[PDB]
């Protein structure tokens, strides 16, 4: 990918870049999933051993306060601001807010809201005054790459994201193990109740949570499962990674071309009765200028 920016890339030291990041040593892990209920079109399989070079990865998704500092320093205008609208979940649109008639096929709970963007996540009249440490949302893949580049960083590959999110466990279902609420404790921010009609908020949140909510995984990463979908570097496919080759098993970058970029981790909207996509092997995608109230990112870096 070859992006274009209208800000210069600032000089930053290794110590500055590494703040808030954890060092993942080089090594192998078992990537992918073979849950019999996985949707074939998602391409969770095959399970395979992947070798990665050492990398750094953010403990937290990028927050509102951090994204605000980037915008203040650069004047960056997000894709949602250029388009003039972004996607908001229906339950979060205040009555009377102007909304577009737009329809996401098969997903009527998504509303296209003029004026929804990172600083006004439910549309005009909303703000982030009480969410400085929540993940930034309504950021597209382009916006994420711009932030990451300004910060001296990059997006993780899907394999880097998954190695880090698995937190040293071999083929567990979730970042922390195989049970969703071990010891009766919520470990992530997803949906509870009846999707899309009623979220009971049993885990404490019916929207985004602070980036440091819940216990971390074994490598010190927070909210890799749930909270917000997280953009990765790779172009999406369902089958490129089914080939067994150095390109797909050593520092894999995904296919060279595509139409949508990978997103990982699930969000506050995910639920077992609908998508079941908060398992660590899960994966989907979105087109790179798209944005939504449940999608953000975390950065990686080369040491």
């Amino acid at each position: 990918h070859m992006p274009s920016f209208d800000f210069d890339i600032p000089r930053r030291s290794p110590q500055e870049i590494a703040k808030g990041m954890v060092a993942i040593p080089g090594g192998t892990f078992r990537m992918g999933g073979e849950d019999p209920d996985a949707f074939p079109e998602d391409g969770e399989g095959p399970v395979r051993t992947v070798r990665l070079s050492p990398f750094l990865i953010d403990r937290y998704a990028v927050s509102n306060r951090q994204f605000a500092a980037f915008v203040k320093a650069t004047g960056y205008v997000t894709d949602a601001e250029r388009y003039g609208w972004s996607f908001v979940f229906h339950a979060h649109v205040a009555p009377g807010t102007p909304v577009m008639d737009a329809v996401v096929p098969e997903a009527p709970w998504w509303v296209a809201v003029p004026g929804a963007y990172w600083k006004a996540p439910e549309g005009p009249g909303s703000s982030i005054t009480d969410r400085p440490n929540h993940p930034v949302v309504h950021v597209s893949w382009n916006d994420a790459v711009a932030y990451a580049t300004w910060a001296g960083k990059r997006l993780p590959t899907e394999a880097e994201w998954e190695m880090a999110a698995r937190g040293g466990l071999d083929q567990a279902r979730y970042p922390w193990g195989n049970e969703l609420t071990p010891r009766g404790r919520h470990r992530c921010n997803i949906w509870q109740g009846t999707f899309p009609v009623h979220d009971t908020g049993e885990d404490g949140y019916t929207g985004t949570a602070p980036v440091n909510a819940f216990a971390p995984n074994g490598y010190g990463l927070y909210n890799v499962a749930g909270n917000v979908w997280e953009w990765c570097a790779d172009w999406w496919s369902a089958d490129w990674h089914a080939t067994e080759s150095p390109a797909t098993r050593i520092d894999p970058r995904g296919p060279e071309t595509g139409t949508a970029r990978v997103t990982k981790g699930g969000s506050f909207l995910c639920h077992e009765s609908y998508c079941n996509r908060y398992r660590v092997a899960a994966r989907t995608c979105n087109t790179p200028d798209s944005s939504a109230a449940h999608t953000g990112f975390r950065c990686a870096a080369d040491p």
Partner: peptide
């Protein structure tokens, strides 16, 4: 789920006519 559940709503997806 009748077709594959959708978690990522795309700007392209709403264009239709």
């Amino acid at each position: 789920x009748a077709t594959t559940p959708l978690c990522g709503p795309s700007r392209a997806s709403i264009l239709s006519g």
